Write a protein that binds this ligand. Sequence first.
Ligand SMILES: CCOC(=O)c1cn[nH]c1C(F)(F)F
Lengths: 300, 253
Amino acid sequence: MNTVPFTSAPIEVTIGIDQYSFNVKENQPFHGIKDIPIGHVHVIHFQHADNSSMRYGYWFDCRMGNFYIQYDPKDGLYKMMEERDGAKFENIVHNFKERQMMVSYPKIDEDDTWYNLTEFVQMDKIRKIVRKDENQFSYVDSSMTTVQENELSDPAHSLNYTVINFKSREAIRPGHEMEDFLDKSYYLNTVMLQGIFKNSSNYFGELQFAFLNAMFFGNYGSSLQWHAMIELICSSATVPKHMLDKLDEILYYQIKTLPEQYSDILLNERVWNICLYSSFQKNSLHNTEKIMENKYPELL
Amino acid sequence: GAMNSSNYAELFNNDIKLFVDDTNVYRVTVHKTFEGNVATKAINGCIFTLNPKTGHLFLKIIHTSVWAGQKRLSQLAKWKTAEEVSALVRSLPKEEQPKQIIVTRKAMLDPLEVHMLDFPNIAIRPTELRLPFSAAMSIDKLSDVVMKATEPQMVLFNIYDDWLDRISSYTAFSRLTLLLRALKTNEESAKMILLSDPTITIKSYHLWPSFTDEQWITIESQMRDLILTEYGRKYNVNISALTQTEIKDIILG
Ligand SMILES: CCOC(=O)c1cn[nH]c1C(F)(F)F
């Protein structure tokens, strides 16, 4: 079980760790998060009490290094850092645990929620979508734009999601205009799966990572990407049975976890109505259709 | 964005543009079967592709053979329209290619945009204007070339005959839309007005009769009366009670 210590908490902040969160007061003796489950990526995240515009966080995997948080009073944020000295790090963590200054990652034994949301999400793939090669962890915030959003400005601070555009030469073979526009199977199976992602696991990873950045940071471009990746599957007549069954599980857990009060901003009425009621796959997403109809019948 | 009453003069500027109307592409007669079911029988159709500045009409005749063994024909008709418009643009020399294509029906936007991906600098626009181009098949010579076709054919016309010798494009378009609106509202009455006086003929190389400037004023008035006469018998409105400002509005409306 791994640990992300904090040097201190000089400003009042709501701290998220995956789907959990807790309030820390200004100068509260808080020194970090322990018992973090090994085997999954994690996201620590922050919303300052004095300024909710400051909404930002770090994707990391404790298997890749020893990470800590330190407040920077100049840039006015909690920064993730790597400690390269294993023995110093162990010595710091041991002291804070002895003085019980750390909150425990509050996982219920029964509860597969985080696994179900991050099944296909890999740190190596996050580090390609979020490009900062000197760090093993990835910074995301509410304002960061996507490569596709920047085409329609600063490229070093962008989310390099795979561009999906239904009215693009990539999506439409010359001479198959109607066929490829009305049935996106070509674009899904040949261009995206075989061509770009290589497999359905990389496609699901991105999709899951887009959702989590939409949910945890209110990142609008991430929400666009999540919906585009759902729509591209739902709008394809020919999808492998294993991919449809898996998509149903992925979307079920995403809809399960979504805070009820953010459903209005985080769900696109057109995509969900098309996917569940109009599309080729309208009858392929049983679990997702049932949770959507019971939790958000107004959107539909 | 959208082509409306606000930006109407744009039609007659020196930027090449085409209207595309797909109303007459897929045409059927609905009939009873021997077992008392209903069936359709397709008849020849046409794409109406018009340069509003020059009057050049690219009439692509859609032969019923296009539909053989196809499903969802009303959907296919939009994509076939978009295919044939994109083929027409590719056939034109670069200096003749349009800078904009205005579709009369919003359902043509996606099909045309997808077929024209190769032409990112050609704007595909809807219009708020309710244009009467469906009535093209009430022009006898256009109806005749469509119904005689035994194969796919493109036929080139000037829908303004020689009017641009005497009037501006703006006035020519206004005359065309009034004639087509009348033909669309009451075909029999409109044809009567156009062809009653047998001394005024249609030249072999023209679509409409050879009216003098004064005769066009009388014809234009007779068409405007017909559109109000019909808008009267439609809504049960005493038209003789209407003033000139409220008359003006209803042809536009
Ligand atoms: C580079 C596209 O992303 C992926 O292929 C992938 C595969 N597992 N996780 C990803 C993520 F997180 F980067 F989206």
